[PDB]
């Protein structure tokens, strides 16, 4: 398949300059040749697209900035060429702004992008290419997302078999959590043109997890793995699925794949989080902090910081750095997903340590509402609410402690905690609880009863009337 | 009041939530995919080309047996039917 030869009409000469793609000289010479030739804008666009395809954006960038000023619009189709040339550079600035991970760089590039996009609107706005470019530019910011939605919608209305417009609508559907429409638009968008970078297909795999199609997602990841091995997102999803498998060998091979992906692209925040959670168990807490700090700083979205901070806070809990663990646990909870509750557990522990019993109970209440069957949180919640002045909470503490005691026959502290609230109104129940605690102390612990329990048992007997036992 | 330890729950220890948790897929809203308007090649539409087998599988719309008859059950029997020839 021949790439093709660009032809340029020479000024005041029938001969045409022909240059093949393979041996095209440096763009620095081509710009001067075109400037001295005064050729039509469509030739500039052809050369611009050639250097863009070659993988060198600098060459394409230079010729397009120089072209837009000294163009020759003395032909019928000048307006279309002018619109495309201006919009191409503007949309490239948006794409390059998205690529960089620095917010300051984003604004600097976005400044000129806004100026040039307004200029393109000046001449013609109804052009479909201009409409999709403006939609992408406005979607980049995130505060103009609804404009992208409307723009892609009527561009889609113009043509149903239109992969870019349908892709934008599907992406926006994903952003707004419209799962069915997102899936439908993705399927149809992939139908429109089978030829496309594999990145679009990655959106399918994760959507399958969004619909709980785990085997379907695994097949999608395998197909993604087979077609392209350079897709970091596909590797991350496969590694996350292996992590979700909850199997020691699954975790080990998932960690190896995570290391490979992190080697491929260490800048991605999510990949580092999964492998650092394993590092925590490896006892190399210094590397755990480094990876957790690296992931937290690298990202710009709030949802990501739910995990990294947690791990770091978790990593900081075993370093006895309770103040910084407290602060970072708070950060993880502040930016948290409904799927994640461990930061609230850790935050409750930090609040407990600091003496903030009420707010610690609030964090534990959130965890319990999210997950009401956890034994550890149940025991802690029962103990914390047992020592509550308010009467209404004493019954809930009783219930939690009763639930804990039934689940755990051998828990001396739970029995004592339950007894300390049964005393208020249930003398027989408190006596039974204290007796049970004494039975475990003598049987398993094999230790003499504490004087406080004996005093409280005697006081209960006194209240009952058994003066001899008292 | 019983003298409970003041940091019995502060100290880190294995918890049920440690092993019961679930990891989630978190990514940018556009999900690592952007409209490649720069290249007209991706803008081209080709209906003649055959669809990928996986894409055909995805197009299938989603809508939201008892083996007892074959159990052996030695005592039970069968049932023959009227035949033109019989002993």
UniProtKB/Swiss-Prot annotation, chain A:
Its main location: nucleus. Keywords: Nucleus, Phosphoprotein, Repeat, TPR repeat, Transcription, Transcription regulation, Wnt signaling pathway. Widely expressed. It is found in: Nucleus speckle. TPR repeats lie at residues 41-75, 129-162, 163-196, 198-231, 235-268, 306-339, 341-374, 412-444. Signal peptide: none annotated. GO terms for molecular function: RNA polymerase II complex binding; SH2 domain binding. GO terms for biological process: blastocyst growth; blastocyst hatching; cell surface receptor signaling pathway via JAK-STAT; cellular response to lipopolysaccharide; endodermal cell fate commitment; inner cell mass cell differentiation; interleukin-6-mediated signaling pathway; negative regulation of gene expression, epigenetic. Coiled coil: none annotated. One of its GO terms (cellular component) is Cdc73/Paf1 complex. Component of the PAF1 complex, which consists of CDC73, PAF1, LEO1, CTR9, RTF1 and SKIC8. The PAF1 complex interacts with PHF5A. Interacts with KMT2A/MLL1. Interacts with STAT3. Interacts with SETD5. Interacts with ERCC6. (Microbial infection) The PAF1 complex interacts with Zika virus French Polynesia 10087PF/2013 non-structural protein 5/NS5. The interaction with viral NS5 proteins may reduce the antiviral immune response by inhibiting the recruitment of the PAF1 complex to interferon-stimulated genes, thus preventing their transcription. Component of the PAF1 complex (PAF1C) which has multiple functions during transcription by RNA polymerase II and is implicated in regulation of development and maintenance of embryonic stem cell pluripotency. PAF1C associates with RNA polymerase II through interaction with POLR2A CTD non-phosphorylated and 'Ser-2'- and 'Ser-5'-phosphorylated forms and is involved in transcriptional elongation, acting both independently and synergistically with TCEA1 and in cooperation with the DSIF complex and HTATSF1. PAF1C is required for transcription of Hox and Wnt target genes. This is RNA polymerase-associated protein CTR9 homolog. The lineage of its organism: Eukaryota, Metazoa, Chordata, Craniata, Vertebrata. The chain holds residues 1 to 470 of 1173 of the full protein.
Swiss-Prot record, chain B:
Disulfide bonds: none annotated. There is a cross-link at residue 78 (Glycyl lysine isopeptide (Lys-Gly) (interchain with G-Cter in SUMO2)). It comes from the Eukaryota. It is found in: Nucleus. Component of the PAF1 complex (PAF1C) which has multiple functions during transcription by RNA polymerase II and is implicated in regulation of development and maintenance of embryonic stem cell pluripotency. PAF1C associates with RNA polymerase II through interaction with POLR2A CTD non-phosphorylated and 'Ser-2'- and 'Ser-5'-phosphorylated forms and is involved in transcriptional elongation, acting both independently and synergistically with TCEA1 and in cooperation with the DSIF complex and HTATSF1. PAF1C is required for transcription of Hox and Wnt target genes. Component of the PAF1 complex, which consists of CDC73, PAF1, LEO1, CTR9, RTF1 and SKIC8. The PAF1 complex interacts with PHF5A. Interacts with POLR2A, TCEA1, SKIC3, KMT2A/MLL1, SUPT5H, RNF20 and RNF40. Interacts with UBE2E1. Interacts with PINT87aa which is encoded by the circular form of the long non-coding RNA LINC-PINT; the interaction enhances the binding of the PAF1 complex to target gene promoters and may anchor the complex on target gene promoters, sequentially pausing RNA polymerase II-induced mRNA elongation. Belongs to the PAF1 family. This is RNA polymerase II-associated factor 1 homolog. It comes from Homo sapiens (Human). The gene is PAF1.
């Amino acid at each position: 398949m021949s790439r093709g030869s660009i032809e340029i009409p020479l000024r005041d000469t029938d001969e045409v300059i022909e240059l093949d793609f393979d041996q095209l000289p440096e763009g620095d010479e081509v710009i001067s040749i075109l400037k001295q030739e005064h050729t039509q804008l469509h030739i500039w666009i052809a050369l611009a697209l050639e250097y863009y395809k070659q993988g060198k954006t600098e060459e394409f960038v230079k010729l397009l900035e120089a072209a837009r000023i000294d163009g020759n619009l003395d032909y019928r189709d000048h307006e279309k060429d002018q619109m495309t040339c201006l919009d191409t550079l503007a949309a490239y600035y948006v794409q390059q702004a998205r690529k960089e991970k620095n917010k300051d760089n984003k604004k600097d590039l976005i400044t000129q992008a806004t100026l040039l996009y307004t200029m393109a609107d000046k001449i013609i706005m109804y052009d479909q290419n201009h409409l999709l470019g403006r939609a992408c530019f406005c979607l980049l910011e995130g505060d103009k997302m609804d404009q992208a939605d409307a723009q892609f919608h009527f561009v889609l209305n113009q043509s149903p078999n239109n992969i870019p417009a349908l892709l934008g609508k599907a992406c926006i559907s994903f952003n707004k959590k419209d799962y069915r429409g997102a899936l439908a638009y993705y399927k149809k968008a992939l139908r429109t043109n089978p030829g496309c970078p594999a990145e679009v297909r990655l959106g399918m795999g994760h959507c399958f997890v969004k619909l709980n199609k785990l085997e379907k997602a695994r097949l999608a990841f395998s197909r993604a793995l087979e077609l392209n091995s350079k897709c970091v997102g596909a590797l991350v999803g496969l590694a996350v699925l292996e992590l979700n498998n909850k199997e020691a060998d699954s975790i080990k091979n998932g960690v190896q794949l995570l290391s490979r992906a992190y080697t491929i692209d260490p800048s991605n925040p999510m990949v580092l989080n999964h492998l650092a959670n394993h590092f925590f168990f490896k006892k190399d807490y210094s590397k755990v902090q480094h990876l957790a700090l690296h992931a937290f700083h690298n990202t710009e979205v709030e949802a990501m910081q739910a995990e990294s901070c947690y791990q770091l806070a978790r990593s900081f809990h075993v370093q006895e750095d309770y103040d910084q663990a407290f602060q970072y646990y708070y950060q993880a909870t502040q930016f948290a997903s409904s799927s994640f509750v461990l930061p609230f557990f850790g935050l409750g522990q930090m609040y407990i340590y600091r003496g903030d019993k009420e707010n610690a109970s609030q964090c534990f209440e959130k965890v319990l509402k999210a997950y009401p069957n956890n034994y550890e949180t149940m025991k802690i919640l029962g103990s914390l609410y047992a020592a509550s002045e308010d009467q209404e909470k004493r019954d809930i503490a009783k219930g939690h402690l009763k639930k804990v005691t039934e689940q755990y026959p051998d828990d001396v502290e739970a029995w004592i905690e339950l007894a300390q609230i049964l005393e208020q109104t249930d003398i027989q129940g408190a006596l039974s609880a204290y007796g049970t605690a004494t039975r475990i102390l003598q049987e398993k612990v094999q230790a003499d009863v504490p004087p406080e329990i004996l005093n409280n048992v005697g006081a209960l007997h006194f209240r009952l009337g058994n003066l001899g036992e008292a | 009041t019983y003298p409970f330890d003041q940091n019995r729950f502060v100290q880190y220890k294995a918890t049920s939530l440690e092993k019961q948790h679930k990891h989630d897929l978190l990514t940018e809203p556009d999900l690592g995919v952007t409209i490649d308007l720069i290249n007209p090649d991706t803008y081209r539409i080709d209906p003649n080309v055959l669809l990928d087998p996986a894409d055909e599988k995805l197009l299938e719309e989603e809508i939201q047996r008892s083996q007892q008859h074959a159990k052996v059950v030695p005592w039970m029997r069968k049932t023959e039917y009227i035949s033109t020839e019989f002993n």
